Amino acid sequence: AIGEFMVSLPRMVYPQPKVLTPCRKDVLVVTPWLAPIVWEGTFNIDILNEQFRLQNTTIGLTVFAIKKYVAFLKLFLETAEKHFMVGHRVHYYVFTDQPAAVPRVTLGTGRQLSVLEVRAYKRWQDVSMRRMEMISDFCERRFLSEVDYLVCVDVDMEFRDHVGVEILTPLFGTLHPGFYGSSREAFTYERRPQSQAYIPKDEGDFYYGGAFFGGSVQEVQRLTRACHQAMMVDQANGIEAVWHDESHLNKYLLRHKPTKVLSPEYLWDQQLLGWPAVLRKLRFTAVPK
Amino acid sequence: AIGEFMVSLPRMVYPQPKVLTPCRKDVLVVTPWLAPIVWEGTFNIDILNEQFRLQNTTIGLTVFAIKKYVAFLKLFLETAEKHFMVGHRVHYYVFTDQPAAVPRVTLGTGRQLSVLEVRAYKRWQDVSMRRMEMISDFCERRFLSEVDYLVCVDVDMEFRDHVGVEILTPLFGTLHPGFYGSSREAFTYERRPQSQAYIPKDEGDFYYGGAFFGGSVQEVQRLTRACHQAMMVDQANGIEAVWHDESHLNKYLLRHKPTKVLSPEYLWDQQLLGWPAVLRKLRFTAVPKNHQAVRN
Ligand SMILES: O=Cc1ccc(-c2cn([C@@H]3O[C@H](COP(=O)(O)OP(=O)(O)O)[C@@H](O)[C@H]3O)c(=O)[nH]c2=O)s1
Ligand SMILES: O=Cc1ccc(-c2cn([C@@H]3O[C@H](COP(=O)(O)OP(=O)(O)O)[C@@H](O)[C@H]3O)c(=O)[nH]c2=O)s1
Ligand SMILES: CCCCCCCCO[C@@H]1O[C@H](CO)[C@H](O)[C@H](O)[C@H]1O[C@@H]1O[C@@H](C)[C@@H](O)[C@@H](O)[C@@H]1O
Ligand SMILES: CCCCCCCCO[C@@H]1O[C@H](CO)[C@H](O)[C@H](O)[C@H]1O[C@@H]1O[C@@H](C)[C@@H](O)[C@@H](O)[C@@H]1O
Ligand SMILES: [Mn+2]
Ligand SMILES: [Mn+2]
């Protein structure tokens, strides 16, 4: 459950935080709306694990494996078992057009997987964009009565390192790995005013990646419904956003500030971008395709 | 109100946050449990003002002026009018044993003041400590119906710069000006194991000041009730914590991590501690108080 009040921790021994000697001096670790930006060195996972375990937190993880992308499921799930919310309750939701093709993956205690049979759209853009509709529909159908938080990710990925409760919050987005160091005028936001995803050159905080977002079930339901509705308006008006669901995701988080922002540790492509000094860990990374 | 969901902001024009060039590199701006530590340069007040105005946020501000401390009210309130939550709904709660001694202070629109007549304890230590009980009591009687957030401060103080919605969060404490740079072994926590407020030398994140804490009414009710109950246990055990209510506040916040921590910008004594480079603003500062002293 998501507790309405602070929880009481037991005695713990850990290094004292030092007010005058911050660990991370190379990156911004808080947004101008005072949401943490999550990098290695900014959190003590022991304290956070205690806080969330004490609430018996259940985390849902949605992933779409439509048509040939079912091939990505084995590695995705096997590596999630090693790295994703270990110690906590996890409910995987696998959206697929081929239930029989979902690999048999052995799960740790307290972890379960549900297979959701869905339509396969012809255009890859529609497969990607319709995720918003399908998530929003299932936020109502299932997630609201089943999980506390939802984490929505791409399937063509693997976990290489810890992805834990440090990300959980009412609403989070993730810094796109290609653009975290870019100026806002360079962001590939939708720039046509005719699109609902329109963002002018003088607005924008970050470029968030469509491959990793989440939050409380109610905030994710609102986000996904909003994005789908905006995409349908665009479709009626004969327009498709330059980067599809990601463009609408970016318009949504511009107007509704996320309560945490994940660093590109959480969404990386080592093949395309290497391993910069600013990344101490590569947590969730692209698989070649 | 406290909105259940994220609010939708209008178009705004402001400088882009730079991921690779943080403004404050001289201080910790986030705790190990991912709570912001609030310093100048860490927040855009226009964005936060929009977020909170859209929820029609009402902030309560509690202040005790018992016995001679009524002398501090005029300056406290007059400076609060200039610096505290300007633009937002504010409700001042003045707890006092002398209702008639509360000065007339002209208030801006959307701002109001209530005088809460309470008992005056003989010992100054009890006057200070019983604030917890009194705050908790009135949370049930008044605050839950009247405000969204409660801010609880010492009266022997004045505002000198902005104190606004950047501080608002479910539960917050403030870095004590004397110890923000100290190691935990030098923190003046209660060190007696027999005290409910006991914290050993290998525990502790920060030393928070008893003069400035707050949060949602519900969290403040819980904190003040817990601190009062702890003090009553100590009393029954013939124990009084070394720094009274502040010792129990520190025990409580050690075990229930605050969702924001305020920098000593928000609790300072310039006469005693000067003006270190790390403080770009002095927002809420000590006023001389030796003349209002009353011998037990
Ligand atoms: O051959 C072109 C394709 C582009 C996307 C395709 C696709 C994507 N997806 C899902 O949408 C997500 C986004 O597509 P993508 O990973 O290929 O997009 P990018 O991360 O490369 O921008 C995938 O991770 C899957 O979850 C599918 O399940 N089946 C698919 O056939 S197929
Ligand atoms: O002569 C010794 C005294 C110590 C505290 C006294 C006192 C405090 N108070 C309140 O307790 C708060 C804390 O006491 P303090 O400011 O004097 O002490 P510090 O906590 O700053 O060390 C004050 O700000 C007032 O709100 C009173 O209302 N009346 C008082 O007579 S009197
Ligand atoms: C230095 C100048 C900017 C250089 C930027 C280089 C990475 C570009 O990235 C693409 O960015 C698009 C938005 O503009 C979409 O997010 C697309 O899905 C993404 O590629 C996806 O994510 C990438 C990380 C790769 O994994 C690619 O294979 C994916 O298709
Ligand atoms: C390692 C060197 C540490 C050096 C610390 C120097 C400041 C000490 O401060 C006192 O600290 C106490 C706890 O230990 C209480 O909070 C007390 O109320 C406070 O004095 C109050 O606040 C002060 C700022 C002054 O305004 C003083 O007049 C007040 O009575
Ligand atoms: Mn992908
Ligand atoms: Mn004081």
Residue numbers in the entry:
A (entry chain B): 58 to 346
B (entry chain A): 58 to 353
Paper text:
One important example is the biosynthesis of human ABO blood group antigens, which is the most important blood group system in transfusion and transplantation. GTA catalyzes the transfer of GalNAc from UDP-GalNAc to the H antigen acceptor (HAA) (α-l-Fuc-(1→2)-β-d-Gal-O-R, where R is glycolipid or glycoprotein) to form the A antigen, whereas GTB catalyzes the transfer of Gal from UDP-Gal to the HAA to form the B antigen. Among these is the enzyme AAGlyB, a dual-specificity GT, which can bind and utilize either UDP-Gal or UDP-GalNAc with equal efficiency.
The previous structure was obtained in the absence of acceptor, thus in the present study we soaked HAA acceptor into AAGlyB crystals together with 1 and Mn2+. The solved ternary structure shows well defined density for both HAA and 1 including the 5-substituent at the uracil base. Importantly, the entire active site loop in both chain A and B of the asymmetric unit as well as the C terminus of chain A are well resolved in the AAGlyB-1-HAA structure and in a conformation that has not previously been observed. Moreover, the C terminus of chain A has adopted an ordered state up until residue 353, which is folded over the donor binding site in a conformation alternative to that observed with the natural substrate. When comparing the AAGlyB-UDP-HAA complex with the AAGlyB-1-HAA complex, it can be seen that the C terminus in the latter structure fails to form the short α-helix, and neither His-348 nor Arg-352 interacts with the acceptor or the donor analogue. In this alternative conformation the main chain of Val-351 now forms two hydrogen bonds to the formylthienyl substituent of 1, and Asn-353 is forming hydrogen bonds to the backbone of residue Trp-181 as well as the side chain of Gln-182 in the internal loop. These additional molecular interactions provide, for the first time, a structural explanation for the tight binding of 1 to AAGlyB. The structure of the AAGlyB-1-HAA complex with a complete flexible loop and C terminus reveals, for the first time, a new, “pseudo-closed” conformation for this enzyme. Our results suggest that this pseudo-closed conformation allows the transfer of the sugar, albeit at a slower rate than the native, closed conformation, and could therefore be the reason for the small, residual turnover observed for AAGlyB toward 1.
